[PDB]
Each structure stands twice: as structure tokens, then as C-alpha cells.
Symmetry: C3
Subunit: 176 residues, 3 copies
Amino acid sequence: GHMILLKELKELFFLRTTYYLKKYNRSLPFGDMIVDRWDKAKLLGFGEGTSIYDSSIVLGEVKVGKDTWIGPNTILDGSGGGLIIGSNCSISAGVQIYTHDTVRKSLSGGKADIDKASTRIGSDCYLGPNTIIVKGVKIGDRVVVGANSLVLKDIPSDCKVFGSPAVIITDSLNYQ
Amino acid sequence: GGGHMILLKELKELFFLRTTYYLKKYNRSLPFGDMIVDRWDKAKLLGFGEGTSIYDSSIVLGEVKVGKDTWIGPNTILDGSGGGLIIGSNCSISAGVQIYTHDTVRKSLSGGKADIDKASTRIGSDCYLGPNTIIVKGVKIGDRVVVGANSLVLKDIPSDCKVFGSPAVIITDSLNYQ
Amino acid sequence: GGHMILLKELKELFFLRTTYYLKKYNRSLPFGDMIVDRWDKAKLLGFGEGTSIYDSSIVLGEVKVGKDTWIGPNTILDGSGGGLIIGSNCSISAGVQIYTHDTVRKSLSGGKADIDKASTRIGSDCYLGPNTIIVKGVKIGDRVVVGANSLVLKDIPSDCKVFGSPAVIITDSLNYQ
């Protein structure tokens, strides 16, 4: 009856895929056709209108505002002092936001502690695909962070940044 | 009674048995979803061409056409929601590759007031997109193109080119690879 | 019918397991990672004691991992092209992809060329930051820092810190030890 569960799961996958294509014009991972993104967000205590894919990892204390879109394959790590994210943010596919790292733990052969620092992002921000935000970063409001960036330092409001490591390119007023 | 306890136990047993089978038959260990979902059958169900495969972990939005013998890797995004995405035959769409026809920059930056911006995207045949390549909306990639890993492609790429970088630049031709 | 009942039970189990992880483990994980235990998975794959690996990781072919190594989510450990060896006390961050093959020629030749392969090795006490990509044939010594978003195309000696796409030696890693 593990053969039975497997067959029932393959059937359900087929049926959910068919449903999703016909009704929502998309095909998702199996996990994402069980989990509703808005119900998941609500269960995690996020603000109304916020949505989060099944494939996201949310660690520790994470607060998120209203109407924020948390994409697939994301990491929201508030384990090292908490992570706060505002309203109307785009947290694109693959974005990873941290409040700790294990560099010293590893390099020390297992001896050093994990290093921790809180991180914060304002409202009306766009974090592009595969952006990495390290511990301790404060991102102000209305910020654009381009795809593939690595943010190592605070970003003031109304800035657009880009690069690994990210640098301020211009202001974001043209997008507003 | 105790229904979800029984379901959890059977899921754990199934995971152990599927992992065992995949190790023995296919010398790999995959996410649980990828040991339920068959990559070729999934491609079939999405109407992709013969020989095409796609992992469970992929997201396919809107109108996406894919040719024959194309490999769509894990953790990928094939977003055809903003006027369609077309991909040719014999392409490597590596793990982590994200291909877009829309973005939500202005929508966010305007505090939720601006529309989503959209533009169709197209990729030819015999192309390699390396791990974690990001292709933005409006981009047209010709045939026989190499995009190196970690690239961000902001503009059209002619056939027979090799590109690299964030943003990506043409560094040479791809003839060495053909 | 029977599939609608399975769906409802899966939704219930998702809610229950999420509550469990939030309240006991202070986290919310993908559904797949709330079925598979990371240490038991690592044990099933033959990895050293103390090692863990997320459900979302793909492990291909022959792969050896030492003790107390953390293999993150959304990772690729590809030992299909002559094997991959990883030491002990390593952090293999989220998104890291480690290869021993590629399919560039196969695609660019229209499906005619063979897959190219080369073994890869990483020492002990190493850190690979988020989204690092390691290509085939690479050897990384002990006590190396690879910064986030790096692409590693060549061997890295012990006690180095590297960064970039492609990655270059920036300094030594002694300060982290």
C-alpha cells in the first residue's frame, strides 16, 4: 500500500497539474499545488495580501508587511536577531536574506560560534532574482536591488543598486 | 482516527523506499517531489516536444513552448505570462535558470499602483544556458548560443555567440563548442 | 473521489506539520522538508556523522561527504562525472551547485557530442557562500572561503579566500580560523 500511496500521489499530481493549467494557466511543483500561498503567509503571521511559495524557508523571527510577494526558492532567515520586511515588496525567486553566517564556525573546524546580526528591508522595495542580502543590512524604503546582486552594506531609501558586491547606481525615482 | 499520523508514517516509508529505488536503479537521490513526478511525463503533460524533460521543482507560467530533446533543470522558472516564451530543441536549461516575460519593479516601487510590465522572450535551438542564468523580458536569443553560468542577459543575443557576465556581454563566438 | 480525500488530508498534514515546525523548531519549511529529516537523509546517502542535507538537494552519482558538514537547500551535489568528495565541517550554502560534468558541447552540437566530465573535490573546514557554482575538475583545498555568488573555474589552494564570477584569490582565510 506504499505502491498504492505512490499511485494515488502520481494521480493527484496529474489532476492538480490539469486543474492548475486550465484554471490558473500554470504548472507548479507538487508541493505548490497543495499549499496555498496566501494561507501559508497567514499561518506564518504575515500581513494581509502577502503570499509565499511552498519552496521558501522561513527561519526564526520574520515579520512581513502587507501585499508583499515572497517568491519560490527563497530564504527568509531571521534566526540572528530577527528579519523585518515591509509592504508591497517583490522578493523575487531565489532571493536569500540572512541574519547569520557560519563562515567562522566552518573555517575554525567547528569551534567558533555562528555570527548574527538583524536585517531589515523597508516598503515598496524590489529585490531582483537571486539577490543575496547578508546579515546586518538595513535597506530603506523604495529601493531597487537588481538581479544577481550581493548586498553587504546599508542602502538608503530611493536608491537603485546593482552588482556583487552591490553599489549605488542611481536613484529609483523613475520606477516610482 | 489518527489519520494524518498514518499518512505521515506512510509518506516517510515511501520516501525511504523511493530513495532506495532511485539509488539502485538511477544512482541518484532526489527531492521527494522528483521521485513522484517523472520528468518526461511532466514535459508531455505541459505539451513540450518529444525527448524534453522537466523537473518537478520547475515553475511554468502562461504560454510556454519548448522544442524536442530540451532538458529543463531543477529550480528553474519558465515564465511565459507576458506574451509567451518560446524555447527550441536540444537546449540545456541549467539548474536555477530563470527566464522571464514580465517584471514587477514599478508595481513595487510605486507602492502597488503601477501595472506589471511585459514582453515576450524567445530562445533558439542548440543553446546552453549555464547555472543561475537570468533572462529578462523582451530578450531574443538566436540559435547555438552559450550563456555562461551566473549571467544576466538584458539584450538580444545573435546566433553563434558566447556571452558571460552580469550584465552579459558577447565575449566570442560559440563555434569551438559546435 | 479518493484523490479529493488525499488532497484534503495532505492539506491538513501541511497545516499540522507547519504548526509543529513553527512552534517546536521556530521555522517554516517546504512540505518535502517536513517529511524528510535532514540527518536521516544524510545517513541514508552514506555521509559522515553529524552531516545533514535538505530534501530539496539533488545528489547525483558518487558523492562522499565527511562529518559535520551542512548541505543546504536547493543545492546540487553532482558526482556523476568521476565523483565528488567533500570534507568535514563544511558549509555548503543554499543554492550551491557543484558539478563534475557539463552539457555545453552536447547542446551546441545539436545533441551529437558527448557529455564532458571531470572529478571535483573540496577539503575540510570550507565555506561555500550562497549560490556559489563549482565547475567540473576543480580542487578546493582545506580552510577555503568562497564568497557568495562566486563561479569557481580553477583549483583553490588551502587557506585562501576567493570571490567573484569568475572567482579570484582576494586574500588568505586565516582571520576566519
